Amino acid sequence: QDSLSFGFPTFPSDQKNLIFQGDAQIKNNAVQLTKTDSNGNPVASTVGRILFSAQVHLWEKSSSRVANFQSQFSFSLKSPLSNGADGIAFFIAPPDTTIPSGSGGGLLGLFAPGTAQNTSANQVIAVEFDTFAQDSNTWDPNYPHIGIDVNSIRSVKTVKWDRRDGQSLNVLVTFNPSTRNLDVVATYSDGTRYEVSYEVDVRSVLPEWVRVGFSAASGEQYQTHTLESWSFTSTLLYT
Amino acid sequence: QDSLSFGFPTFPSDQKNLIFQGDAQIKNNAVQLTKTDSNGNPVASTVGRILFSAQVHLWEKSSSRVANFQSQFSFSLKSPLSNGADGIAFFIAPPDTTIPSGSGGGLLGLFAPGTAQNTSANQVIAVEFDTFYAQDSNTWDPNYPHIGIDVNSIRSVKTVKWDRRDGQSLNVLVTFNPSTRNLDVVATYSDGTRYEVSYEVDVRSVLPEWVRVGFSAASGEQYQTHTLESWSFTSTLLYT
Ligand SMILES: OC[C@H]1O[C@H](O)[C@@H](O)[C@@H](O)[C@@H]1O
Ligand SMILES: [Ca+2]
Ligand SMILES: [Ca+2]
Ligand SMILES: [Mn+2]
Ligand SMILES: [Mn+2]
């Protein structure tokens, strides 16, 4: 299809179009990307991802068209620790994507250790919300941030962000094929706003058909990564 | 998802979200539901169906919600002879639905010969466009071309006389309103000729909560092409 859209105002347990990977599962009308104990508390060493089943037609060679898409979602992070980790990300990748071997912790379940920083060994665009160390994650700034990843865990750009325990963050990620701008706008309920944009030609990074979803992980330090709602729309346009 | 929508202005050969059953295949940016030869002409004894891969949440027990949906599509029928068979249908059925054994010809690839008229043995809502075309092989339904609404039976609960026009595209709009429980069908040719048929039906008592939607077509001894040219669909769960 040239156009596709779906909306999950909430996530009831009865799902049919979601692909669950790792420890991801539905609990309390929300998606818990990372594992939580029986009491609902986060645990260490966990990775989880979800993908929408239907493939998205991102671009089409024959017609020289590229999709204009919008992804709106909200999530909350919670942890009894002073340093909850590691983060959650919205990502776009090839349809057969699976969790890479040893991609826990700072790799967010998105990249394999051996090629995490090799743009030629990866095909993925992701928007990450990182809450976690200059000794391990020697590739990220010295503070929580929102980062745009293009075939590498080493963000092409980042902006400072504040982690607020248990508070929902509303995010809108849009891509405009005419300007090739990928824009990210995130807000907390009190109006605090964060914005970051990057110009990228998706045709040179991703295949024509892709899948979209979310990934999260916790290493030694942990926190819940709760996806509360998600709406997505994409339509092929002439450029 | 509470809401889902997709649109196929045309059908390129590179499809990823369509389930092809029987002889259905993409050809010339359109879906040929029934088999065609090298010249592109219709052949006999052929059945084909397509379904969208994502499941549609038609209703939700826990919340007491039922979906409002709309399906818009266009198709054309062509045959070397002045008339053709057997017809095409838009249908809604359980996710694992497959072509019933021996459901060719007049059964449109939707029902099994043994229970084609047994409502308790079927779970399907379909809007068919019948053009044959044969009281000898299709004793059911009125004796003239028609559009019919099928609910668990090949014997339409409601029909309206229809005109077959070789090679001309018919634009169809199928809508279901959970508030009135009316399933409305409006079909029109480019010159403005319009056909309307509707029926009240509680989808909850007929189909499971999650379903798949698609099209089916068949040709027995008599044949014609059943070309699906475009299709857009959209559903949203609403409180009743
Ligand atoms: O195709 C016309 C006609 O051919 C045969 O008689 C059978 O397959 C019928 O079901 C069908 O209606
Ligand atoms: Ca980072
Ligand atoms: Ca009929
Ligand atoms: Mn990090
Ligand atoms: Mn018939």
Side-chain angles (χ1 to χ4, degrees), chain A residues 155-159 161-166 168-179 181-219 221-232:
Chain A
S155 307
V156 293
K157 57 164 50 188
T158 67
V159 295
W161 173 54
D162 308 277
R163 176 187 188 291
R164 297 184 178 179
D165 206 76
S168 297
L169 184 70
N170 273 292
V171 185
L172 175 63
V173 177
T174 66
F175 179 67
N176 185 313
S178 63
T179 65
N181 280 44
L182 179 65
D183 298 307
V184 178
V185 181
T187 62
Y188 278 116
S189 66
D190 68 342
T192 303
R193 191 191 196 73
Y194 308 84
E195 302 179 1
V196 62
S197 302
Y198 184 70
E199 184 187 302
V200 58
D201 191 315
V202 302
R203 302 182 303 176
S204 64
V205 178
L206 298 168
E208 303 180 73
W209 293 81
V210 303
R211 265 175 174 143
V212 295
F214 298 79
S215 184
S218 290
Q221 287 64 224
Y222 47 93
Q223 62 187 172
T224 59
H225 300 84
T226 310
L227 180 61
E228 298 163 346
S229 63
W230 178 38
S231 297
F232 177 96

Side-chain angles (χ1 to χ4, degrees), chain B residues 63-77 79-117:
Chain B
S63 65
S64 181
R65 291 185 295 171
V66 184
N68 169 181
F69 68 75
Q70 175 184 296
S71 181
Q72 177 186 310
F73 59 87
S74 66
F75 66 92
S76 60
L77 305 179
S79 177
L81 305 179
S82 299
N83 207 307
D86 280 277
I88 178 180
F90 166 64
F91 70 109
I92 310 171
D96 59 357
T97 183
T98 55
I99 298 177
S101 183
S103 59
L107 294 182
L108 304 177
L110 295 179
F111 310 78
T115 59
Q117 300 184 59

Side-chain angles (χ1 to χ4, degrees), chain A residues 2-9 12 14-17 52-57 60 208-209, chain B residues 2-9 12 14-15 17 52-57 60 209-210:
Chain A
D2 286 15
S3 56
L4 175 70
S5 74
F6 53 80
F8 295 88
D14 185 47
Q15 296 301 309
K16 304 296 180 178
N17 301 307
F52 187 66
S53 63
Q55 291 181 48
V56 177
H57 202 180
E60 190 174 62
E208 303 180 73
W209 293 81
Chain B
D2 282 17
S3 62
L4 179 67
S5 301
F6 58 75
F8 294 87
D14 187 8
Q15 292 302 308
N17 301 311
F52 188 66
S53 62
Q55 290 178 48
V56 182
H57 202 180
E60 189 176 63
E209 299 178 67
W210 294 86

Side-chain angles (χ1 to χ4, degrees), chain B residues 45 85-86 104-107 132-134 137 140 218-220 222-223:
Chain B
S45 301
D86 280 277
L107 294 182
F132 186 59
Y133 185 59
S137 57
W140 59 74
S219 292
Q222 311 295 52
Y223 46 98

